[PDB]
């Protein structure tokens, strides 16, 4: 993936739709309730993100990368992991716990 | 809970919105179709409640 930037910073956003996932794999769960976020988070409990990546840079160099999740309780990006990424593959993943607020 | 994700019915009695005015050459939202019948059913409920009550034998 080519990360172009004019500011020295670029973003790769991912969106995960738990409604369609829960409708497909668990259609018995009532996702129409005002409590659907609590039901889905109480059902999943603890979520971990695994994210294996490398940078197309010289093997002696590295770039700072942050894995972030949006927290809707505080309306901000929360940093869950900070790593230096080089030519070598690394998992930058983290356990984010309960997903209700995400 | 028809305001949920599958349907997204936008009906709410406080808004005092009585009619869905469709326009040509635009998407036909399923939420609009749900609200179209929800408005009529709500006003039919009001019309019944001003005469009858929950359990009234006809």
Which 3-state string (H, E, C) describes A27-66? CCCCCCCCCHHHHHHHHHCEEEECCEECCCCCCCCCEEEE
Token pair for A64: 């700072």
Task: Find the chain B residues whose C-beta atoms sit closer than 8 A to any C-beta of A.
Answer: 1-2, 4-7
Kindly report the CA angle at B11 between B3 and A40, in degrees rounded to 5? Answer: 5
Closest to A42 measured CA to CA, from A96, A80, A99: A99
- Taken in order A71, A77, A79, A84, the sign of the CA dihedral is positive
- The Cα-based distances of B12 to B2, B9, B38 in angstroms read 11, 9, 9
Distance from CA of B5 to the nearest CA of A (A): 6
Half-sphere exposure of A102 (CA within 13 A, CB side): 25
Cβ separation B1–A34 shorter than 8 A: yes
CA dist., res. A28 & res. A94, Å (int): 30
For residue B2, list chain A residues with Cβ-Cβ distance below 8 A: 32
For residue A19, list chain B residues with Cβ-Cβ distance below 8 A: 5-6
CA dist., res. A42 & res. A44, Å (int): 6
Closest to A99 measured CA to CA, from A33, A16, A4: A16
Q: Given in angstroms, what resolution was this structure solved at?
A: 4.4
CA dist., res. A97 & res. B51, Å (int): 54
CA dist., res. A94 & res. A4, Å (int): 26
Residues 6 or more apart from A102 whose CB is under 8 A from it?
A: A69, A70, A71, A72, A96
Cβ separation B5–A31 shorter than 8 A: yes
Size of interface A-B (CB pairs under 8 A): 18
């Amino acid at each position: 993936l080519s990360m172009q930037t004019t500011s020295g910073v670029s973003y790769l956003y991912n969106n995960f739709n738990f409604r369609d996932y829960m409708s497909k794999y668990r259609p018995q769960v009532d996702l129409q309730s005002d409590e659907a976020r609590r039901i889905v988070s109480d059902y999943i409990k603890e979520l971990s993100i695994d994210y294996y990546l490398s940078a197309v840079i010289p093997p002696d160099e590295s770039i700072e990368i942050k894995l972030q999740v949006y927290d809707f309780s505080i309306n901000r990006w929360l940093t869950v992991s900070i790593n230096n990424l080089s030519f070598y593959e690394k998992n930058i993943g983290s356990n984010i716990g309960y997903i209700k607020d995400y | 809970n028809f305001k949920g994700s599958p349907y997204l019915d936008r009906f709410d009695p406080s808004k005092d919105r009585t009619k869905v005015l469709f326009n040509p050459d635009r998407p036909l939202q399923q939420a609009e179709l749900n609200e179209m019948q929800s408005i009529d059913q709500y006003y039919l409920k009001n019309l019944g409640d001003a005469i009858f009550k929950d359990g009234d034998k006809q």
